[PDB]
Amino acid sequence: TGRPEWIWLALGTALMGLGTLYFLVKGMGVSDPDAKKFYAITTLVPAIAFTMYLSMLLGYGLTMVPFGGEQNPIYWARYADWLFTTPLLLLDLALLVDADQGTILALVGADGIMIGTGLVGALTKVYSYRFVWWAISTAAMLYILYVLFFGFSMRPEVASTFKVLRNVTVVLWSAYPVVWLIGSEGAGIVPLNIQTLLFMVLDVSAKVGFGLILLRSRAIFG
Amino acid sequence: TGRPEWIWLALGTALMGLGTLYFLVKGMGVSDPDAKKFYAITTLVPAIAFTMYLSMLLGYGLTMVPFGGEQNPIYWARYADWLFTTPLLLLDLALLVDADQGTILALVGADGIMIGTGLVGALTKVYSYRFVWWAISTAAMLYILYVLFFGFSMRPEVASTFKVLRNVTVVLWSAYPVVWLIGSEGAGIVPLNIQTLLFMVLDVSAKVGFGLILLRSRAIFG
Amino acid sequence: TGRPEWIWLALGTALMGLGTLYFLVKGMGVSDPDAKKFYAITTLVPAIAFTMYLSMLLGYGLTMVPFGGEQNPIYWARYADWLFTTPLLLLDLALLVDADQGTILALVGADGIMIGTGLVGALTKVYSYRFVWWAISTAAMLYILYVLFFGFSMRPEVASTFKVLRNVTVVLWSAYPVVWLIGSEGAGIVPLNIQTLLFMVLDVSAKVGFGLILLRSRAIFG
Ligand SMILES: CC(C)CCCCCCCCCCCC[C@@H](C)CCCCCCCC(C)C
Ligand SMILES: CC(C)CCCCCCCCCCCC[C@@H](C)CCCCCCCC(C)C
Ligand SMILES: CC(C)CCCCCCCCCCCC[C@@H](C)CCCCCCCC(C)C
Ligand SMILES: *C\C=C(C)/C=C/C=C(C)/C=C/C1=C(C)CCCC1(C)C
Ligand SMILES: *C\C=C(C)/C=C/C=C(C)/C=C/C1=C(C)CCCC1(C)C
Ligand SMILES: *C\C=C(C)/C=C/C=C(C)/C=C/C1=C(C)CCCC1(C)C
């Protein structure tokens, strides 16, 4: 179509779709109660992203936001996607390390604030304020990464896989506030099609790649 | 009023209301921890539907959607209703069979995708796309029914009641994608008042009738 | 700014902000699994309110609602705030008394109906109907307070702290339906700036003061 970013949305849609079907088939047969939780989460996440990418592709998950005296196309559906997939993702890490519930609630709450304020920032019409919400969102992100890095005796296999996905999480999650800032959502330093491309690549990395790593570990089996 | 479907919304409102009060009174005295969960769920579900039916009756839970070059009255509040009551309903069946958490998360997630994409379909302005979302929603439904049918040793009483409500669930839930397709939401083969009538009858069946069956079983008691 | 209520929104923002940082620092070091849940909740609640107060201060968490032939400024973000903080608050009391899950689900469900119908009331354009939703919301509140008062052997310390926060909860929560009724949201007997002032004072009392009392108790430690 007329939206140059469509190809990234179509590609994103296809890969989340393919990832969902992979994990869906991959998850067949799994009877270990613990393995099943990781499979459920890891299958659900790209299943949601699939529907959210398709809504952006079809034009539903997009709105227009006035700021800078300009009409800025804001794919709100990315935030809806993140609002559900990032706590699931954290759930993966919490179950991994048998996190305390209080810590999980801390993380999921901080996460909802993270996406919620990033959405608010994305939809805020007063340009300067966009970055106040960015800053607060980023602070919630930093809290989360802090908890994950310096909070989260497990078996060596758990500790081992946790360290991998933990380092993946930091680099990956940290890229999102940077893509937003430089992208058409924030400072408009990079145009929307490039920004969509970037977020697509991070999302598929976070929602299929991350799952491929997790589900490759015996750490998910009790 | 001027909306011919009002009587079905008024009737739906009254019966969910009456059902809530019934289960509320019925639930008094129940001290068994397990029985209390089934009562909580089974009381909450029509309590929510009551508020959602009343919002449709009063005109709040309704929006207008352009497609087919027509202004289509979409009772979005039915989806809000379903978004909360159908996982509760699944919760009833999961607790029944002592489902694994991973399986519950699978089900609740698939359920949210089911209602979420059905809502998206209901609000989609490009007519053809309405049915893409229908198809995806229906696929999530089929997944759920698959899990419930061929996934979900329990006591004979549990197995017995599970089989009943399971068969009820399949026929009942399966009717919804058919009513949407033929109704003014989808192909416009049946007009809105008839479609509302149909959904009211299914909702009261799913939100009061189903609860009457469940709460009639000793299966809910530990 | 031009909104006379801003100072109450700015003050509310500052105090929820200060409260969050206090509990955040206060919560450092806590390793007791149980204490951590109370800290997580009690820190998250004003963290959310902080973001919600700031959204009202900046003008994002506000919409205009036609009724009485007037344009009524409705701070929808207060309801978003409440929708998340009041179940957390109930969670605090449930964990306190080791509530049955069925009872918690009952409470959280009734709570969502409470805020959900109060939001619907706040956004309802037919003036009379505003109070039908108020009445239903209030009935859900009364249910909750009923459960908390005459439903919720614990150690004397638990029973002791529960009784305090329980009495706090009744007086505090009960003030909200009164402030809405007399405030510009309901009968317009008290103007919006006064109404905002009132809700700010209740919110800080409920979201920082209540937490200061809870976190002051050894009842939160296993
Ligand atoms: C361990 C196995 C079986 C791996 C195969 C993965 C297949 C699943 C579906 C396709 C997507 C997954 C690949 C993960 C890679 C990412 C981090 C990002 C790649 C995105 C872009 C397309 C190029 C890569 C492909 C492998 C599709
Ligand atoms: C087991 C007992 C006590 C049963 C009595 C149920 C009473 C509760 C409130 C009213 C509604 C419930 C009836 C369930 C029946 C449905 C499947 C659908 C009937 C809807 C339409 C009205 C006609 C039936 C009535 C019984 C109200
Ligand atoms: C037990 C200790 C350390 C108490 C100190 C609390 C400090 C935290 C942040 C500021 C707010 C908290 C005070 C709670 C009081 C309320 C019930 C309402 C007071 C609101 C208005 C401002 C005046 C009071 C202040 C103490 C800020
Ligand atoms: C899809 C899955 C994941 C891992 C996405 C991660 C999302 C974030 C870490 C987003 C963070 C944001 C911040 C910190 C500030 C700007 C707004 C964002 C929501 C993009
Ligand atoms: C109220 C309670 C229940 C049991 C309602 C069930 C709802 C569904 C099974 C709805 C399914 C839909 C699908 C499959 C596709 C069209 C959109 C719907 C959301 C109606
Ligand atoms: C912020 C924290 C808390 C304790 C707020 C409590 C909120 C309520 C008890 C609100 C109740 C309402 C009712 C009963 C009817 C009018 C609408 C309200 C949502 C204000």
Side-chain angles (χ1 to χ4, degrees):
Chain A
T1 73
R3 285 173 300 140
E5 72 266 13
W6 75 270
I7 180 43
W8 308 133
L9 300 183
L11 220 209
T13 293
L15 301 171
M16 299 295 191
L18 283 36
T20 306
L21 295 172
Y22 179 72
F23 295 134
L24 261 193
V25 165
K26 235 252 217 191
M28 295 157 102
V30 185
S31 60
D32 176 70
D34 270 46
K36 286 144 81 145
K37 298 175 215 184
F38 289 113
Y39 269 97
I41 289 143
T42 305
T43 302
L44 234 217
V45 158
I48 295 164
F50 165 77
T51 64
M52 294 293 94
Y53 261 84
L54 174 70
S55 80
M56 297 180 286
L57 173 58
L58 299 187
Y60 181 82
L62 166 72
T63 184
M64 291 296 175
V65 166
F67 63 93
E70 291 177 279
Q71 291 271 121
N72 316 263
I74 299 303
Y75 284 105
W76 64 260
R78 276 200 260 75
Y79 299 88
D81 187 27
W82 298 339
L83 177 81
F84 301 121
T85 59
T86 53
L88 284 178
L89 261 3
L90 295 174
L91 233 211
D92 270 338
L93 301 165
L95 292 172
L96 216 35
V97 316
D98 183 20
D100 281 340
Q101 281 153 243
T103 298
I104 296 163
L105 166 59
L107 279 169
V108 174
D111 195 273
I113 290 172
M114 179 179 79
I115 308 298
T117 56
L119 174 72
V120 167
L123 295 181
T124 279
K125 298 140 258 279
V126 176
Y127 186 63
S128 283
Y129 294 173
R130 294 183 65 86
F131 301 95
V132 169
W133 294 111
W134 180 85
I136 291 159
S137 181
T138 295
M141 185 196 67
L142 285 179
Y143 175 80
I144 283 152
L145 294 183
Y146 178 81
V147 169
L148 298 175
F149 202 149
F150 303 105
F152 272 34
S153 64
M154 32 211 192
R155 11 209 228 282
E157 13 144 19
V158 156
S160 198
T161 295
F162 173 68
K163 264 207 185 79
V164 173
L165 299 169
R166 172 165 84 197
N167 310 332
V168 169
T169 289
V170 168
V171 161
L172 239 184
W173 287 44
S174 292
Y176 283 82
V178 174
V179 174
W180 190 110
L181 197 60
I182 84 203
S184 43
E185 250 66 327
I189 314 167
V190 161
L192 181 58
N193 63 134
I194 301 310
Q195 167 190 273
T196 301
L197 163 60
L198 292 176
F199 276 138
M200 190 261 283
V201 169
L202 299 166
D203 281 341
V204 173
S205 298
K207 300 168 193 337
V208 175
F210 185 95
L212 280 172
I213 304 167
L214 171 67
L215 294 198
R216 261 266 173 295
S217 165
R218 207 85 245 252
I220 73 164
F221 284 94
Chain B
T1 73
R3 285 173 300 140
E5 72 266 13
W6 75 270
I7 180 43
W8 308 133
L9 300 183
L11 220 209
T13 293
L15 301 171
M16 299 295 191
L18 283 36
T20 306
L21 295 172
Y22 179 72
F23 295 134
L24 261 193
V25 165
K26 235 252 217 191
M28 295 157 102
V30 185
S31 60
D32 176 70
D34 270 46
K36 286 144 81 145
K37 298 175 215 184
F38 289 113
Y39 269 97
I41 289 143
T42 305
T43 302
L44 234 217
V45 158
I48 295 164
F50 165 77
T51 64
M52 294 293 94
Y53 261 84
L54 174 70
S55 80
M56 297 180 286
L57 173 58
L58 299 187
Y60 181 82
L62 166 72
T63 184
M64 291 296 175
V65 166
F67 63 93
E70 291 177 279
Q71 291 271 121
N72 316 263
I74 299 303
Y75 284 105
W76 64 260
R78 276 200 260 75
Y79 299 88
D81 187 27
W82 298 339
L83 177 81
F84 301 121
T85 59
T86 53
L88 284 178
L89 261 3
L90 295 174
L91 233 211
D92 270 338
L93 301 165
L95 292 172
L96 216 35
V97 316
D98 183 20
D100 281 340
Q101 281 153 243
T103 298
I104 296 163
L105 166 59
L107 279 169
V108 174
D111 195 273
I113 290 172
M114 179 179 79
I115 308 298
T117 56
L119 174 72
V120 167
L123 295 181
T124 279
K125 298 140 258 279
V126 176
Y127 186 63
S128 283
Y129 294 173
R130 294 183 65 86
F131 301 95
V132 169
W133 294 111
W134 180 85
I136 291 159
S137 181
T138 295
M141 185 196 67
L142 285 179
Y143 175 80
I144 283 152
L145 294 183
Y146 178 81
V147 169
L148 298 175
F149 202 149
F150 303 105
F152 272 34
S153 64
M154 32 211 192
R155 11 209 228 282
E157 13 144 19
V158 156
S160 198
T161 295
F162 173 68
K163 264 207 185 79
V164 173
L165 299 169
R166 172 165 84 197
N167 310 332
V168 169
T169 289
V170 168
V171 161
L172 239 184
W173 287 44
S174 292
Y176 283 82
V178 174
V179 174
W180 190 110
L181 197 60
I182 84 203
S184 43
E185 250 66 327
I189 314 167
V190 161
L192 181 58
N193 63 134
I194 301 310
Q195 167 190 273
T196 301
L197 163 60
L198 292 176
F199 276 138
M200 190 261 283
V201 169
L202 299 166
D203 281 341
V204 173
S205 298
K207 300 168 193 337
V208 175
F210 185 95
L212 280 172
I213 304 167
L214 171 67
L215 294 198
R216 261 266 173 295
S217 165
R218 207 85 245 252
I220 73 164
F221 284 94
Chain C
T1 73
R3 285 173 300 140
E5 72 266 13
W6 75 270
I7 180 43
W8 308 133
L9 300 183
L11 220 209
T13 293
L15 301 171
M16 299 295 191
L18 283 36
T20 306
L21 295 172
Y22 179 72
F23 295 134
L24 261 193
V25 165
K26 235 252 217 191
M28 295 157 102
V30 185
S31 60
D32 176 70
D34 270 46
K36 286 144 81 145
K37 298 175 215 184
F38 289 113
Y39 269 97
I41 289 143
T42 305
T43 302
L44 234 217
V45 158
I48 295 164
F50 165 77
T51 64
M52 294 293 94
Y53 261 84
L54 174 70
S55 80
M56 297 180 286
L57 173 58
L58 299 187
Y60 181 82
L62 166 72
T63 184
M64 291 296 175
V65 166
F67 63 93
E70 291 177 279
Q71 291 271 121
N72 316 263
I74 299 303
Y75 284 105
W76 64 260
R78 276 200 260 75
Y79 299 88
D81 187 27
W82 298 339
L83 177 81
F84 301 121
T85 59
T86 53
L88 284 178
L89 261 3
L90 295 174
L91 233 211
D92 270 338
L93 301 165
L95 292 172
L96 216 35
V97 316
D98 183 20
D100 281 340
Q101 281 153 243
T103 298
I104 296 163
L105 166 59
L107 279 169
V108 174
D111 195 273
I113 290 172
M114 179 179 79
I115 308 298
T117 56
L119 174 72
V120 167
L123 295 181
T124 279
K125 298 140 258 279
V126 176
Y127 186 63
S128 283
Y129 294 173
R130 294 183 65 86
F131 301 95
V132 169
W133 294 111
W134 180 85
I136 291 159
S137 181
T138 295
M141 185 196 67
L142 285 179
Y143 175 80
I144 283 152
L145 294 183
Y146 178 81
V147 169
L148 298 175
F149 202 149
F150 303 105
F152 272 34
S153 64
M154 32 211 192
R155 11 209 228 282
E157 13 144 19
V158 156
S160 198
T161 295
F162 173 68
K163 264 207 185 79
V164 173
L165 299 169
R166 172 165 84 197
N167 310 332
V168 169
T169 289
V170 168
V171 161
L172 239 184
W173 287 44
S174 292
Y176 283 82
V178 174
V179 174
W180 190 110
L181 197 60
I182 84 203
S184 43
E185 250 66 327
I189 314 167
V190 161
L192 181 58
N193 63 134
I194 301 310
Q195 167 190 273
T196 301
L197 163 60
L198 292 176
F199 276 138
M200 190 261 283
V201 169
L202 299 166
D203 281 341
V204 173
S205 298
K207 300 168 193 337
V208 175
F210 185 95
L212 280 172
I213 304 167
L214 171 67
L215 294 198
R216 261 266 173 295
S217 165
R218 207 85 245 252
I220 73 164
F221 284 94

